[model samples]
Target: KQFHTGIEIKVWAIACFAPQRQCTEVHLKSFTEQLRKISRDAGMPIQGQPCFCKYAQGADSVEPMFRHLKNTYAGLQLVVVILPGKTPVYAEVKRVGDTVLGMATQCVQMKNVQRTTPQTLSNLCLKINVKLGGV
Candidate 1:
C-alpha cells in the first residue's frame, strides 16, 4: 500500500537562513539539494528560486534577518532555518516568523544539515507541507 502522502497546495517561494558561525556554504548547498529532491518527489516542487540568508549565531541576529527576507521576498511561502545546537535561535525564529512576520518557517538542526539525508529532509518536508496548508 502507498504509505506516504503529500501536500495539496504548492509552495511557490522558499528562503533559507543560517548562522555564519554554525552553518557554512557547503552545508547549505547540500541541504538545499536534498530538500529539493525530496520536495519534488513528494509532488510539491519548489517553483521559484529559493533565497539564502546568513546571520551571526543568536536570536538577535535571526529575528531581523527574518524580517529582512520578509521585506525582500514578496510572496515567500516558507523560511527554512538552520540552527546551531541547543540554541535560542529557534524560539526567536518562530516568534518573528509566526507572530511578527506571519510566514511559514521550518527549522532544521545543524547535524541534519551536515549529513544531508533524504530521511531528514523528508521529515522536514512533512512539517513544511503541513505548514503550507498541505494535507
Candidate 2:
C-alpha cells in the first residue's frame, strides 16, 4: 500500500493498439486529464502534462519504456491505466513490478472490458475515476 514516490511522479498514461484508430485515443486523453484533475482536487497533486502520457505500440513496448520510466524518474511508480484490450501490458506491469523490489509498484485498472468507443471509454473512465478515489 505504500506506493508513494518521494519525488513528483509523472503519472503517465498509455494505451495499446485498438482495432480502429481513435476508438480509444480521444477518450484516453480526456480520461487521464480528468484523473489528474480529480486527484489534485482530492488533495494528491499529480502531473497533468498532456505530453506525459503516451500510446504504447504494443505489449512489447511496455517493459523497456517502463524500465526507463522507473530508472530515469526518481522515486518512480506507475499508473498502468489499462483497457481490457491492453491486458498484455497490464499483466506485464502487474507481474513484473507489483512487488517489493528496488522499485515496487501498484496499478488501477478499469472494470468492464469493451471496444474503445466514446461510450465504452467513458464507461471505463467512470469506473477508473472511482477506483482512484476521484469524485
Scanning candidate 2 in windows of ten residues, the lowest lDDT window is 1-10
Query: What is the C-alpha lDDT profile of model 2 across 31-111, one tens digit per residue?
Result: 556656654654444577632355555557656666666665564444444544446756666555555233333343333
TM-score of each: 0.80, 0.53
For each candidate, the alpha-carbon lDDT, in order, equals 0.67, 0.48
In candidate 1, stretches whose alpha carbon ends up further than 4 angstroms from where it belongs are: 1-22
For model 1, give the 10-residue run with minimal summed lDDT. Answer: 8-17
lDDT value, candidate 2, whole model: 0.48
Model 1 Cα lDDT, one tens digit per residue, 1-135: 222454433333333344555567777776777777777777866533465545455578766777777787676667777777777778888888878878788888888987877778878877776676533
Model 2 Cα shift for residue 49 (angstroms): 1.6
Give candidate 2's root-mean-square deviation (CA, Å).
6.6
Off by over 4 Å in 2: 1-20, 23-25, 99-135
Candidate 1 structure, TM-score to reference: 0.80
lDDT of model 2, residue 78:
41
